[PDB]
Amino acid sequence: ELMIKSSNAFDVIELSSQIQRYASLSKINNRTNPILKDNKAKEFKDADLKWLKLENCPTAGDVPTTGNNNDLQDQFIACDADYRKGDLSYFGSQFEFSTYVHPSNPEIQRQIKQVVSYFQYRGMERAFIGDAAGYVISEAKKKGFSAQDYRIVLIEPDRVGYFESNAISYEEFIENPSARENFLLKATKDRTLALAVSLAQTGEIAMQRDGSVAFLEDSELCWDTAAGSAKSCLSVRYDTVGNKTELDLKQIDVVSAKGLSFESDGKTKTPVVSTYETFQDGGRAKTINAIECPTGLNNRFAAVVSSFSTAGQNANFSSESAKDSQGTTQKDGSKGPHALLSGISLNWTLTNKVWDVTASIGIESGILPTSGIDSGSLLRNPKSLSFIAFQWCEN
Amino acid sequence: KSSNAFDVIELSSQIQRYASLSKINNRTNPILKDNKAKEFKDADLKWLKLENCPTAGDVPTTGNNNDLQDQFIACDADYRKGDLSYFGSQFEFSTYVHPSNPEIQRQIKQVVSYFQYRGMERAFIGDAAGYVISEAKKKGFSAQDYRIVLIEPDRVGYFESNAISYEEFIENPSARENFLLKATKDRTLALAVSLAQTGEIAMQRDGSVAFLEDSELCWDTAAGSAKSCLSVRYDTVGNKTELDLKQIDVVSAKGLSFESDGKTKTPVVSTYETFQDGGRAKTINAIECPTGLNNRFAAVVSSFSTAGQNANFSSESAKDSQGTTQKDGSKGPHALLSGISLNWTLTNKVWDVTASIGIESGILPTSGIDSGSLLRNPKSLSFIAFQWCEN
Amino acid sequence: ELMIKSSNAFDVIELSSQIQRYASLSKINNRTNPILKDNKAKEFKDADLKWLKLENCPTAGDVPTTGNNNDLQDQFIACDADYRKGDLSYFGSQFEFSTYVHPSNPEIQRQIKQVVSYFQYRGMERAFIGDAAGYVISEAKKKGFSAQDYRIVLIEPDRVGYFESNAISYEEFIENPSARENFLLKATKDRTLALAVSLAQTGEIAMQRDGSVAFLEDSELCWDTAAGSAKSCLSVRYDTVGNKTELDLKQIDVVSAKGLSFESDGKTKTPVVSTYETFQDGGRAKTINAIECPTGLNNRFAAVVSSFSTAGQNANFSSESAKDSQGTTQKDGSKGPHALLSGISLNWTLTNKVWDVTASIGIESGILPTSGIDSGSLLRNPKSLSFIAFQWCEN
Amino acid sequence: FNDNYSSTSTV
Amino acid sequence: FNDNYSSTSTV
Amino acid sequence: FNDNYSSTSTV
Ligand SMILES: [Ca+2]
Ligand SMILES: [Ca+2]
Ligand SMILES: [Ca+2]
Ligand SMILES: [Ca+2]
Ligand SMILES: [Ca+2]
Ligand SMILES: [Ca+2]
Ligand SMILES: [Cl-]
Ligand SMILES: [Cl-]
Ligand SMILES: [Cl-]
């Protein structure tokens, strides 16, 4: 019975939906989508559909497996599959690309802009391709596909794959008898008459566990929350002025991360973290443990002056709220007035996960003893100093 | 066409969702605004279309036409087609006092959607019901009181003059023919559709479905478990929501902004700076800001001495300081200090940073980079530069 | 069409889709799918369909309910359902699994790779299984049911379940009489002739609002954006070269948070935020509002010196781009040259959301008046000072 | 610094 | 600091 | 600063 139309259209939508899924994946079974590895602006994939079958099949396809054949293998069509049957017979698919640098997959050189899957019409009368197309649109709606961007085309080989020499919208083919016949008037034997299928997913379509289904533009990913009847959402917006995308988390009160990295001027950084530091008694260098950096980043450090005086060892600067400063050591060992200052140096070296910090305060000469921690014109690793330590990681 | 069974369940499932919501796109559900105990909705389904369509619908959208509007059917939609033809829906309401929405005057008790049979032979309504219910169960729906009925007008809507359960029509041939004998052409034959969603719900591409409270969105990882999921939690005492990413080891962003005390900021990034020879201002390129934020800068003192030009402070681990320039051209000891100024001005994406060290007079030459009582843009200085962006 | 042709095929598809529904769910009625709880690589489910009926049936099935009889119970087939009827008679289902560690559900120990459901043929002539299978495939397309392979098979009892001694694709069985007749010749008395309906669990599986289904390794959660055909995605990656998972947001231009916290050395942190500060005229102490900390974190503060001189009160440092410094006050009240320096102290105490900040610049003695804001050897809360104030929160 | 603080001088 | 800046001295 | 650092003085 001539409901083989509907059944034929079912197969057209089934195959096209799987091509769309494949076209939406950057990785398939933990390996780069092979079609993304090249850099040409167009590619046509053959109608035998080996490029869409798994590599581990009785005949080997082009779609990668993991390597362990006990794992679950994501797949698209069965390996004995063939869609070059029926009145709408699969003729191949036209991929159009733009170049793309993937932030985490150096193997990817392009991104897909559009995929068109062609089904040549082998019906008995060529003017009935319109009727057949009506069934594909119906089957599309049944699987959540828009069914609003269809056209009938004539295709012939190009230097690369094929090109559409002429096209007419499905709506003009059905409603415009003049345009219809003018189109059919071009359907010579050198060209191939075909339905051109570009599927767009309605908002009803389910999100898939491999991620091939993208959220619609301006839609939000939301959670029910114990705020009751409130839902807290995030979304990825694009701003046409400035040409930038934003991950908007501002509807949630706090984003709580563990490790966190970001970029400044192409370089990767961790947020600076700060401590209040003083040297302890005895003129000995200060050891500060280095933060553990994310892999690929390296430790940075900076010390900045908060409080100082020329008392050297005769000081307690360890409280943030008060400073104890008892003056400068004199030649006879007594504590005198505070000498005048000429410089402060803060130095730091990273050796084996430890920042070794040293400091010197330069003061007027002729006051300090000849020997000791405070001697000559230098107060070495003085207590009369407080600094803030900033640590971060960068590349 | 051959999409009739899909359309029957699609339309019925959207009508059921409408009936389960008190609000649609931030406005009260128009059907709830009265208190009549029963109401029938027209078969043309204009009442289910958005108001912002060529013909005005009755379902509210947000007043703003930017973001996505929750909708139930398309505006050109017509479901009064096919062998099972949408005939309208009979809503039953109960009186209900709203705890927080004064516009709602009633609550929904039940919705039944009728699809009129337009086939020439009525005995096939059983098969047609079978494809409808098969599509219902495939979509996670249980049919409620699934029945084949004959309906004729009433005061408000319609009433079921005769009915037979879908199960009796298929399993009891006598009741079937008895019912079928009653189904004359003068009467209207109908499928009565009441759906209850019994299966769980898939996340949808329009974002209309929210994750359940306390659920985790997870990725398979070769790391195993407990490090691959994220979630949105609620604090009941402090009335705060948290996007909990702490199961992931590192959050890796490109641009990053956060809020502090009503202002939006990017993280401070720091550089180690010294002036080179020659006493010129130092140019530091301003970072590129996110849209709507502007450049900020601060320089703070790390190391200094009074050697001025006679210094090299560019190593972080040691400082070379050779004293203050004397007027007789020689280098003497380090003179005593009175001040340090650090100044910065933004001009065409460059921060021009200048510094001065003020020192005791009567030591430096009368002219030059180090002259009078000033060391101009001295080398005997290391400062930390902080940059960030804010609104 | 809304009329049933084959009524056996109608029943086969119903049972077939409900097996499809069951296999795609990790949870049923708020509980783990029973078939995921074991660790065997293969398991065969009986033809009586006990394993598919609800636990609350008069006779107990294996499918869990919510325990609460107030809730709606998700169900697959009715309690009195029996599919061992008709020319194609349900014979059982062969589930094949792979081992699996679920990221958040320890009750799940395996994942389904494929389900093969068997329908033994009981028609008078063995070759008509071709026709009956054809009605199943046709009825499937009419009902929107997508299986991944249809085959005619001979099965024999096993130690565990069954195994397929022989199989032939539905297409070769109807198109190739030689393969067909050779196949039927293997249908000895110990074997069962059957239609094999094959479900393959792929990446198409729907993501559930309860989070019971995980994204595949390295898959991308994507948004359509107004850049047109551009897609903006995020994902959770694992890099074994450092044994760390990464929430990769680098495809999006800006991550925009409200509150933000991260970890450094096991401690929780908020970003450091800075203000440029000077004291008001008159030597009065400085007040700075403490930032709001997330609950469970505490306020921290540090002030670091940016500019200073010994001018005391005779100065204005409030502009970031220029400094006005008019010398040190002399004993007679006049403004003299800038005195020499011996120290700077910066002090800060938190009192009820306010940081009280004081400062002192120590200078050479014998120059200042005996009393006043600038007196002895001290310039108190001086205007001849600019400091950077850093705040952050920590636990 | 408290008010006991004092320094050397150039006077 | 602008060029009017001056200090005390040890000369 | 290394131990060669020295400054002017008020004595
Ligand atoms: Ca570098
Ligand atoms: Ca700007
Ligand atoms: Ca439930
Ligand atoms: Ca096949
Ligand atoms: Ca034979
Ligand atoms: Ca403020
Ligand atoms: Cl103090
Ligand atoms: Cl200035
Ligand atoms: Cl040094």
PDB file of N, CA and C in Angstrom, chain C residues 26 49 75 89 131 147 158 166 173 187 210 212 214 221 223 235-236 239 260 266 278 295 308 337 344 347 356 370 381:
ATOM      1  N   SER C  26      17.937   5.373  34.327  1.00  0.00           N
ATOM      2  CA  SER C  26      18.731   4.969  35.478  1.00  0.00           C
ATOM      3  C   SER C  26      17.865   4.836  36.723  1.00  0.00           C
ATOM      4  N   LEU C  49       7.768 -11.743  31.709  1.00  0.00           N
ATOM      5  CA  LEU C  49       7.766 -10.295  31.918  1.00  0.00           C
ATOM      6  C   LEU C  49       7.550  -9.916  33.389  1.00  0.00           C
ATOM      7  N   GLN C  75       4.913   3.187  35.068  1.00  0.00           N
ATOM      8  CA  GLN C  75       4.804   1.761  34.768  1.00  0.00           C
ATOM      9  C   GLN C  75       5.104   1.498  33.297  1.00  0.00           C
ATOM     10  N   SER C  89       5.785 -14.384  19.156  1.00  0.00           N
ATOM     11  CA  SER C  89       5.530 -14.551  20.583  1.00  0.00           C
ATOM     12  C   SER C  89       6.767 -14.167  21.389  1.00  0.00           C
ATOM     13  N   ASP C 131       7.425 -12.207   6.331  1.00  0.00           N
ATOM     14  CA  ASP C 131       6.282 -11.310   6.236  1.00  0.00           C
ATOM     15  C   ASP C 131       5.942 -10.699   7.590  1.00  0.00           C
ATOM     16  N   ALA C 147      14.170   1.178  16.488  1.00  0.00           N
ATOM     17  CA  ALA C 147      15.104   0.165  16.940  1.00  0.00           C
ATOM     18  C   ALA C 147      16.355   0.302  16.099  1.00  0.00           C
ATOM     19  N   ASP C 158      21.401 -21.848  26.729  1.00  0.00           N
ATOM     20  CA  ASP C 158      22.769 -21.685  27.185  1.00  0.00           C
ATOM     21  C   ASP C 158      22.864 -22.087  28.656  1.00  0.00           C
ATOM     22  N   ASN C 166      22.747 -18.885  14.728  1.00  0.00           N
ATOM     23  CA  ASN C 166      22.724 -18.296  13.392  1.00  0.00           C
ATOM     24  C   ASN C 166      21.850 -17.054  13.368  1.00  0.00           C
ATOM     25  N   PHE C 173      17.069 -11.900   4.179  1.00  0.00           N
ATOM     26  CA  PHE C 173      16.052 -12.943   4.281  1.00  0.00           C
ATOM     27  C   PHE C 173      14.937 -12.758   3.263  1.00  0.00           C
ATOM     28  N   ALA C 187      17.188 -24.731  11.008  1.00  0.00           N
ATOM     29  CA  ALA C 187      16.128 -24.662  12.017  1.00  0.00           C
ATOM     30  C   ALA C 187      15.726 -26.065  12.481  1.00  0.00           C
ATOM     31  N   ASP C 210      16.171  14.704  37.150  1.00  0.00           N
ATOM     32  CA  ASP C 210      16.643  14.266  38.447  1.00  0.00           C
ATOM     33  C   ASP C 210      18.146  14.029  38.469  1.00  0.00           C
ATOM     34  N   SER C 212      19.871  11.674  37.171  1.00  0.00           N
ATOM     35  CA  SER C 212      20.265  10.267  37.273  1.00  0.00           C
ATOM     36  C   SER C 212      21.135   9.803  36.101  1.00  0.00           C
ATOM     37  N   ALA C 214      24.317  10.637  33.594  1.00  0.00           N
ATOM     38  CA  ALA C 214      25.532  11.418  33.417  1.00  0.00           C
ATOM     39  C   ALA C 214      25.843  11.684  31.947  1.00  0.00           C
ATOM     40  N   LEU C 221      28.354  20.702  26.957  1.00  0.00           N
ATOM     41  CA  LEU C 221      27.068  21.345  27.183  1.00  0.00           C
ATOM     42  C   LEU C 221      27.116  22.672  26.444  1.00  0.00           C
ATOM     43  N   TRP C 223      25.286  26.068  24.136  1.00  0.00           N
ATOM     44  CA  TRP C 223      24.226  27.025  23.861  1.00  0.00           C
ATOM     45  C   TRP C 223      24.347  27.523  22.429  1.00  0.00           C
ATOM     46  N   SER C 235      32.335  22.055  29.511  1.00  0.00           N
ATOM     47  CA  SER C 235      32.455  20.624  29.771  1.00  0.00           C
ATOM     48  C   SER C 235      33.310  20.403  31.010  1.00  0.00           C
ATOM     49  N   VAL C 236      33.258  19.170  31.512  1.00  0.00           N
ATOM     50  CA  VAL C 236      34.073  18.720  32.627  1.00  0.00           C
ATOM     51  C   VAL C 236      35.026  17.671  32.068  1.00  0.00           C
ATOM     52  N   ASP C 239      42.307  15.330  32.897  1.00  0.00           N
ATOM     53  CA  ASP C 239      43.651  15.226  32.328  1.00  0.00           C
ATOM     54  C   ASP C 239      44.468  14.303  33.221  1.00  0.00           C
ATOM     55  N   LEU C 260      31.681  35.063  44.677  1.00  0.00           N
ATOM     56  CA  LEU C 260      32.698  34.152  44.160  1.00  0.00           C
ATOM     57  C   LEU C 260      33.647  33.767  45.286  1.00  0.00           C
ATOM     58  N   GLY C 266      43.692  24.504  51.018  1.00  0.00           N
ATOM     59  CA  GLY C 266      42.611  24.026  51.854  1.00  0.00           C
ATOM     60  C   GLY C 266      41.721  25.098  52.453  1.00  0.00           C
ATOM     61  N   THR C 278      43.381  58.073  51.299  1.00  0.00           N
ATOM     62  CA  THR C 278      44.120  59.108  52.012  1.00  0.00           C
ATOM     63  C   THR C 278      43.287  59.557  53.211  1.00  0.00           C
ATOM     64  N   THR C 295      28.736  33.945  54.598  1.00  0.00           N
ATOM     65  CA  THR C 295      28.659  33.357  55.929  1.00  0.00           C
ATOM     66  C   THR C 295      29.715  32.269  56.097  1.00  0.00           C
ATOM     67  N   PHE C 308      54.237  58.670  49.972  1.00  0.00           N
ATOM     68  CA  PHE C 308      54.391  59.355  51.260  1.00  0.00           C
ATOM     69  C   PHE C 308      55.411  60.477  51.133  1.00  0.00           C
ATOM     70  N   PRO C 337      61.338  73.170  54.406  1.00  0.00           N
ATOM     71  CA  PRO C 337      61.657  72.046  53.527  1.00  0.00           C
ATOM     72  C   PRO C 337      61.126  70.760  54.135  1.00  0.00           C
ATOM     73  N   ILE C 344      57.294  54.604  59.048  1.00  0.00           N
ATOM     74  CA  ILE C 344      55.874  54.766  58.756  1.00  0.00           C
ATOM     75  C   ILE C 344      55.155  53.625  59.451  1.00  0.00           C
ATOM     76  N   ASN C 347      48.103  51.133  61.012  1.00  0.00           N
ATOM     77  CA  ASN C 347      47.432  50.284  61.995  1.00  0.00           C
ATOM     78  C   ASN C 347      45.948  50.153  61.674  1.00  0.00           C
ATOM     79  N   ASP C 356      38.939  50.702  61.359  1.00  0.00           N
ATOM     80  CA  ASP C 356      39.520  51.935  61.895  1.00  0.00           C
ATOM     81  C   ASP C 356      41.005  51.915  61.571  1.00  0.00           C
ATOM     82  N   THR C 370      56.132  71.923  69.349  1.00  0.00           N
ATOM     83  CA  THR C 370      56.112  71.019  70.498  1.00  0.00           C
ATOM     84  C   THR C 370      54.768  70.316  70.642  1.00  0.00           C
ATOM     85  N   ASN C 381      48.144  60.738  61.412  1.00  0.00           N
ATOM     86  CA  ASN C 381      47.160  60.489  60.355  1.00  0.00           C
ATOM     87  C   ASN C 381      47.418  61.454  59.193  1.00  0.00           C
TER      88      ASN C 381
END
